Amino acid sequence: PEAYWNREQEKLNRQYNPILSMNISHLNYCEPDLRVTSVVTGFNNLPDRFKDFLLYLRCRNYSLLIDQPDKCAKKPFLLLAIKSLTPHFARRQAIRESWGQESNAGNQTVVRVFLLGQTPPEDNHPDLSDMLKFESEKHQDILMWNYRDTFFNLSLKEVLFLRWVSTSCPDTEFVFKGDDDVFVNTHHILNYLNSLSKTKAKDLFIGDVIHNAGPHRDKKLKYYIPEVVYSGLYPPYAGGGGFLYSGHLALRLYHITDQVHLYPIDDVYTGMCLQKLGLVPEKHKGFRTFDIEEKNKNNICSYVDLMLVHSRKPQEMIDIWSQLQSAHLKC
Ligand SMILES: *[C@@H]1O[C@H](CO)[C@@H](O[C@@H]2O[C@H](CO)[C@@H](O[C@@H]3O[C@H](CO[C@H]4O[C@H](CO)[C@@H](O)[C@H](O)[C@@H]4O)[C@@H](O)[C@H](O[C@H]4O[C@H](CO)[C@@H](O)[C@H](O)[C@@H]4O)[C@@H]3O)[C@H](O)[C@H]2NC(C)=O)[C@H](O)[C@H]1NC(C)=O
Ligand SMILES: CC(=O)N[C@H]1[C@@H](OP(=O)(O)OP(=O)(O)OC[C@H]2O[C@@H](n3ccc(=O)[nH]c3=O)[C@H](O)[C@@H]2O)O[C@H](CO)[C@@H](O)[C@@H]1O
Ligand SMILES: *[C@@H]1O[C@H](CO)[C@@H](O)[C@H](O)[C@H]1NC(C)=O
Ligand SMILES: [Cl-]
Ligand SMILES: [Mg+2]
Ligand SMILES: [Mg+2]
C-alpha cells in the first residue's frame, strides 16, 4: 500500500505473524522519526497535527504524573473512565455529582477515574496546574500522563489507560469509557450488566457501532485524513462518545495494542484492535451519539431506557440526573 499507516502496519503484521514469512522500536522510540519527511509525499505541506503524529508515532511509553494506585482496592463491578482535558473543571465536577458518583449498591462497586494528558505552556496553554493539583488532592479521581493531550493523541490516551487497567485494575468486571460531555444512565447500565449471562459478558463490547466507514478526504473537516496517510475502509467501531466492555476484554485489548500502530482517531483505533482480536463490536440502540429528538429532550421519560446521550452541558447532566432519580414514579 502507498498510504504510510497501511504500509507501516503491514510491516508490524510481518513482525508478529510468522505465516507472512514467505529496526528501531515501534513502541519506545521517542526521537523524531525523520524518515517520514522523505517517505511521505507532500509531508511538509501537511497540517502540523499530522506532522507531529507521524514524527512521534513510535513512542508510547509515557509515565503517570498523577496516579490513584488504590482506586481498585475494592474489586470494582463497573469502572468509569472519562476522557477529559485539564481546563474542564465544571464538566468533571458535574459528572462527580451526577451519573459518575462512586457507589456500592448491592455491593456492586462503581469507581471513577478521569483520564488527562498534559496541557503544557509550550503550546500556549494557561497554567492551571495548581488548580489541577487542588482538584486531584480533594477528589482523588485524576489520572494524568506526561504527553501532550491533543485530539490526535487520544489513541495514546486509550493505550495508556488500558495499560493502567492491566497494572492497577485488572479485576474490574466491566469498564465504561466515554467523553466528559455525555449524559450516562448509570442505573440503566448496571441493570443491563446484571441481565447478561457470563458467556455474553466475557467478550462484551457494545456501543453506537459504525460499519463500512472510511477516512474523510475533505481537508476542511475535523476527521480529515490525507490519502498519503491512510487508505481503504475503517473496521467497525463504536462511536467514542462512550462504549461498554468487560474487564477480561480490556486485558486482551491491551495485550494486542502492541501489534497495532496508533491512529489519529481514537475510536477507530479501538476498532482496529477489536478486529485483530477477531471480535466485532456490537451495536446497542441505547447509545445516542447524535442526541435524541427535539421534543423528547424535555421529557425525563425519554432517558429511562437510554445508555448515554451526546452531548450535554454540566448543568444539563445534573438536571437530568436529579429528575431521573424520581422517574420511576412518573413513567
Ligand atoms: C503526542 O504527545 C507527544 C508527547 O508529548 C508529543 O511528542 C512531543 O512532540 C513535541 C513536538 O510537538 C516534541 O518537541 C519537539 O522536539 C523536536 C526535536 O527535539 C530533539 O531534537 C532537537 C534537535 O536535534 C534537540 O534540540 C532536542 O533537545 C531533542 O533532542 C524539537 O526540534 C522541537 O523544537 C520546536 O520548538 C522550538 C521552540 O521550543 C522551535 O524553535 C523549533 O523550531 C521547533 O518548532 C520540539 O521541542 C517532543 O520531543 C515530543 N515528546 C516526546 C516525548 O516524544 C506529540 O507531539 C503529540 N502528538 C500529537 C499529534 O499531538
Ligand atoms: C460523541 C463522539 O463520538 N465523540 C468523539 C469525537 O469527539 P467530539 O467531536 O465529540 O469532540 P469533543 O470536544 O467532545 O472531545 C471528545 C472527548 O475527548 C476529550 N478530549 C478532547 C480533545 C483532547 O485533546 N483531549 C481529550 O481528552 C474531550 O474532553 C471529550 O471528552 O471524536 C473524537 C476523536 O477525535 C472521539 O474521541 C470522541 O469520542
Ligand atoms: C521510552 O523508552 C526509551 C527506551 O528506553 C527511552 O529512550 C525514552 O526516553 C522513553 N520515553 C519516555 C517518554 O519516557
Ligand atoms: Cl467546562
Ligand atoms: Mg511541527
Ligand atoms: Mg463531544
Side-chain angles (χ1 to χ4, degrees):
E2 213 153 86
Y4 180 76
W5 190 96
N6 308 74
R7 190 155 36 84
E8 295 303 322
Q9 182 59 41
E10 223 64 48
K11 299 174 188 169
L12 267 202
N13 298 341
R14 295 188 52 253
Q15 175 179 334
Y16 285 100
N17 300 270
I19 206 60
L20 309 181
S21 285
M22 188 76 61
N23 52 99
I24 61 167
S25 170
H26 70 285
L27 300 166
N28 61 0
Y29 187 75
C30 301
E31 291 293 334
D33 182 10
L34 311 179
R35 183 182 160 259
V36 307
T37 72
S38 70
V39 162
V40 182
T41 299
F43 173 87
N44 296 90
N45 299 331
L46 305 168
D48 282 344
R49 61 192 185 278
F50 284 100
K51 289 185 182 181
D52 290 326
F53 176 83
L54 299 166
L55 278 165
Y56 306 101
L57 172 62
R58 304 176 147 261
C59 183
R60 64 178 74 179
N61 54 317
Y62 297 99
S63 308
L64 270 165
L65 297 176
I66 304 180
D67 188 13
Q68 299 295 153
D70 301 317
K71 176 65 57 173
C72 303
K74 184 183 281 264
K75 179 202 186 304
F77 183 69
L78 176 59
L79 165 68
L80 304 179
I82 302 97
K83 300 177 289 169
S84 201
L85 270 164
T86 297
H88 294 178
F89 299 104
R91 294 190 196 184
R92 294 194 288 271
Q93 182 58 28
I95 290 172
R96 297 194 183 94
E97 301 176 10
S98 52
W99 58 264
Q101 51 188 281
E102 302 194 325
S103 69
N104 204 18
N107 213 347
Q108 290 192 325
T109 297
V110 178
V111 299
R112 174 193 68 250
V113 294
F114 296 100
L115 312 173
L116 281 67
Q118 273 195 128
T119 46
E122 309 91 82
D123 300 322
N124 306 116
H125 294 276
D127 189 355
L128 299 171
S129 70
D130 293 288
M131 300 216 59
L132 183 66
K133 202 87 218 199
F134 178 91
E135 179 192 13
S136 170
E137 289 296 342
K138 186 179 190 187
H139 298 287
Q140 300 283 293
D141 53 13
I142 300 286
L143 299 179
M144 191 179 66
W145 290 263
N146 54 22
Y147 67 92
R148 291 178 57 216
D149 205 339
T150 62
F151 270 109
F152 270 18
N153 264 348
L154 282 178
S155 82
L156 192 56
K157 185 175 291 196
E158 168 91 6
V159 174
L160 291 172
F161 161 73
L162 290 175
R163 190 181 76 195
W164 183 85
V165 172
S166 182
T167 69
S168 311
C169 204
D171 291 319
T172 181
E173 195 80 13
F174 297 101
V175 180
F176 173 84
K177 177 146 173 289
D179 299 342
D180 63 358
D181 63 344
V182 301
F183 175 83
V184 180
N185 189 344
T186 313
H187 299 326
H188 189 255
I189 283 187
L190 291 177
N191 296 337
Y192 171 88
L193 295 176
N194 287 316
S195 81
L196 287 182
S197 69
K198 294 218 177 70
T199 317
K200 166 108 180 151
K202 163 87 96 188
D203 292 316
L204 179 72
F205 197 113
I206 62 172
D208 182 8
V209 175
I210 305 156
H211 280 265
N212 301 124
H216 295 85
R217 307 301 193 183
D218 191 326
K219 302 197 306 188
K220 295 266 231 300
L221 271 48
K222 195 219 187 115
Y223 309 115
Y224 157 71
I225 306 288
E227 300 80 351
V228 76
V229 169
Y230 184 86
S231 59
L233 296 178
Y234 290 150
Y237 67 94
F243 41 71
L244 183 69
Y245 55 105
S246 61
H248 169 89
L249 181 57
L251 300 172
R252 301 177 58 202
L253 277 170
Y254 177 60
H255 147 80
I256 212 64
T257 58
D258 268 15
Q259 301 172 223
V260 189
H261 268 305
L262 306 170
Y263 194 75
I265 312 183
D266 64 328
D267 42 16
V268 172
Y269 176 80
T270 299
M272 292 170 168
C273 291
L274 285 175
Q275 184 179 70
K276 188 155 289 288
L277 289 179
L279 297 168
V280 183
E282 169 189 338
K283 166 90 162 191
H284 188 283
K285 62 176 186 173
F287 287 74
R288 311 296 177 92
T289 49
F290 297 117
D291 215 329
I292 60 185
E293 198 268 288
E294 183 88 83
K295 91 160 179 293
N296 293 329
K297 294 188 179 181
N298 83 84
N299 185 213
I300 194 55
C301 306
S302 304
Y303 294 84
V304 178
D305 289 305
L306 301 190
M307 306 277 259
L308 72 77
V309 186
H310 171 271
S311 59
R312 288 296 182 273
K313 298 187 189 66
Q315 208 169 332
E316 296 168 333
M317 291 172 196
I318 293 173
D319 183 29
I320 295 167
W321 182 259
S322 178
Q323 299 183 45
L324 196 58
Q325 303 314 288
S326 77
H328 66 275
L329 302 167
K330 309 160 81 285
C331 313

Coordinates of all heavy atoms in Angstrom, one line a residue, residues 83-85 88 91 149-151 154 157 179-181 222-223 240-241 265-267 310, ligand 2:
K83 N -12.6 10.5 29.5 CA -11.6 11.3 28.9 C -11.9 12.8 29.2 O -13.0 13.3 28.9 CB -11.5 11.0 27.4 CG -11.2 9.6 27.1 CD -11.3 9.4 25.6 CE -12.7 9.5 25.0 NZ -12.7 9.6 23.6
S84 N -10.9 13.5 29.6 CA -11.1 14.9 29.9 C -9.8 15.7 29.6 O -8.7 15.1 29.5 CB -11.5 15.1 31.4 OG -12.1 16.3 31.6
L85 N -9.9 17.0 29.5 CA -8.9 18.0 29.4 C -8.8 18.8 30.6 O -9.8 19.1 31.3 CB -9.1 18.9 28.2 CG -8.5 18.4 26.8 CD1 -9.2 19.2 25.7 CD2 -7.0 18.6 26.8
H88 N -11.3 21.4 32.0 CA -12.7 21.1 32.1 C -13.2 20.8 33.5 O -13.8 19.7 33.8 CB -13.0 19.8 31.2 CG -12.9 20.1 29.7 ND1 -13.0 19.1 28.8 CD2 -12.6 21.2 29.0 CE1 -12.8 19.6 27.6 NE2 -12.5 20.9 27.7
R91 N -17.0 20.3 33.9 CA -17.5 19.0 33.4 C -17.3 17.9 34.4 O -18.1 17.1 34.6 CB -16.9 18.7 32.0 CG -17.3 19.7 30.9 CD -16.8 19.2 29.6 NE -16.8 20.2 28.5 CZ -16.4 20.0 27.3 NH1 -16.1 18.8 26.8 NH2 -16.5 21.0 26.4
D149 N -1.8 16.4 25.6 CA -3.2 16.0 25.4 C -3.7 16.7 24.2 O -4.0 17.9 24.3 CB -4.0 16.3 26.7 CG -5.2 15.5 26.8 OD1 -5.7 14.9 25.8 OD2 -5.7 15.3 28.0
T150 N -3.9 16.0 23.1 CA -4.5 16.6 21.9 C -5.4 15.6 21.3 O -5.4 14.4 21.6 CB -3.4 17.0 20.9 OG1 -2.7 15.8 20.5 CG2 -2.4 18.0 21.4
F151 N -6.2 16.0 20.3 CA -7.1 15.1 19.6 C -6.4 13.9 19.0 O -6.8 12.8 19.1 CB -8.0 15.9 18.6 CG -9.3 16.4 19.1 CD1 -9.5 17.8 19.3 CD2 -10.3 15.5 19.5 CE1 -10.6 18.3 19.8 CE2 -11.5 16.0 20.0 CZ -11.7 17.4 20.2
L154 N -5.3 10.9 21.2 CA -6.3 10.3 22.0 C -6.2 8.7 22.0 O -6.6 8.1 22.9 CB -7.7 10.7 21.6 CG -8.2 12.1 22.1 CD1 -9.6 12.4 21.6 CD2 -8.2 12.1 23.6
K157 N -4.0 8.1 24.6 CA -4.7 8.1 25.9 C -5.4 6.7 26.1 O -5.5 6.2 27.3 CB -5.7 9.2 25.9 CG -6.5 9.4 27.3 CD -7.4 10.6 27.3 CE -6.6 11.9 27.3 NZ -7.4 13.1 27.7
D179 N -16.8 10.1 27.0 CA -16.4 11.5 27.0 C -16.9 12.3 28.2 O -17.8 11.8 28.9 CB -16.9 12.2 25.7 CG -16.3 11.6 24.4 OD1 -15.3 10.8 24.5 OD2 -16.8 11.8 23.3
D180 N -16.4 13.5 28.4 CA -16.9 14.3 29.5 C -18.0 15.3 29.1 O -18.4 16.1 29.9 CB -15.7 15.1 30.1 CG -15.1 16.1 29.2 OD1 -15.5 16.2 28.0 OD2 -14.1 16.8 29.7
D181 N -18.6 15.1 27.9 CA -19.8 15.9 27.5 C -21.0 15.0 27.2 O -21.9 15.5 26.5 CB -19.4 16.8 26.3 CG -19.1 16.0 25.1 OD1 -18.8 14.7 25.3 OD2 -19.0 16.5 24.0
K222 N -13.1 18.0 10.4 CA -12.4 17.7 11.7 C -11.7 16.3 11.6 O -10.5 16.2 12.1 CB -13.3 17.7 12.9 CG -12.6 17.8 14.2 CD -13.3 16.9 15.3 CE -12.8 17.1 16.7 NZ -13.8 17.7 17.6
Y223 N -12.3 15.3 10.9 CA -11.7 14.0 10.8 C -11.1 13.8 9.4 O -11.1 12.6 8.9 CB -12.8 13.0 11.1 CG -13.5 13.2 12.4 CD1 -14.9 13.6 12.4 CD2 -12.9 13.2 13.6 CE1 -15.5 13.8 13.6 CE2 -13.5 13.4 14.8 CZ -14.9 13.7 14.8 OH -15.5 14.0 15.9
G240 N -16.9 7.0 19.9 CA -16.1 7.2 21.1 C -16.9 7.9 22.2 O -16.3 7.9 23.3
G241 N -18.0 8.5 21.9 CA -18.8 9.1 23.0 C -18.9 8.3 24.2 O -19.0 8.8 25.4
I265 N -7.5 8.8 15.1 CA -8.9 8.8 15.5 C -9.0 7.7 16.5 O -8.9 6.5 16.2 CB -9.9 8.7 14.4 CG1 -9.5 9.7 13.3 CG2 -11.3 8.9 14.9 CD1 -10.5 9.7 12.1
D266 N -9.2 8.0 17.8 CA -9.0 7.0 18.9 C -10.1 5.9 18.8 O -9.7 4.8 19.1 CB -9.0 7.7 20.2 CG -10.4 8.4 20.6 OD1 -11.1 8.8 19.6 OD2 -10.7 8.4 21.8
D267 N -11.3 6.2 18.5 CA -12.3 5.2 18.4 C -12.1 4.3 17.2 O -12.5 3.1 17.3 CB -13.7 5.7 18.5 CG -13.9 7.0 17.7 OD1 -13.1 7.2 16.8 OD2 -15.0 7.7 17.9
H310 N -25.4 12.2 23.7 CA -24.4 13.2 23.4 C -25.1 14.3 22.6 O -25.8 14.0 21.7 CB -23.2 12.5 22.6 CG -22.2 13.5 22.1 ND1 -22.4 14.1 20.9 CD2 -21.1 14.0 22.6 CE1 -21.3 14.9 20.6 NE2 -20.5 14.9 21.7
Ligands
LIG2 C1 -19.7 11.6 20.6 C2 -18.4 11.2 19.9 O1 -18.4 10.4 19.0 N1 -17.2 11.9 20.3 C3 -15.9 11.5 19.6 C4 -15.5 12.8 18.8 O2 -15.2 13.8 19.7 P1 -16.1 15.2 19.6 O3 -16.3 15.5 18.2 O4 -17.4 15.0 20.3 O5 -15.3 16.4 20.4 P2 -15.1 16.6 22.0 O6 -14.8 18.1 22.3 O7 -16.4 16.3 22.7 O8 -13.9 15.6 22.6 C5 -14.1 14.3 22.7 C6 -13.6 13.8 24.1 O9 -12.3 13.7 24.1 C7 -11.8 14.6 25.2 N2 -10.7 15.2 24.7 C8 -10.8 16.1 23.5 C9 -9.5 16.7 23.0 C10 -8.2 16.5 23.6 O10 -7.3 17.0 23.2 N3 -8.1 15.6 24.8 C11 -9.4 14.9 25.3 O11 -9.3 14.2 26.3 C12 -12.9 15.6 25.5 O12 -12.8 16.1 26.8 C13 -14.0 14.8 25.3 O13 -14.3 14.0 26.4 O14 -14.2 12.5 18.1 C14 -13.1 12.0 19.0 C15 -11.9 11.6 18.2 O15 -11.4 12.7 17.5 C16 -13.6 10.9 19.9 O16 -12.6 10.6 20.9 C17 -14.8 11.2 20.6 O17 -15.3 10.1 21.4

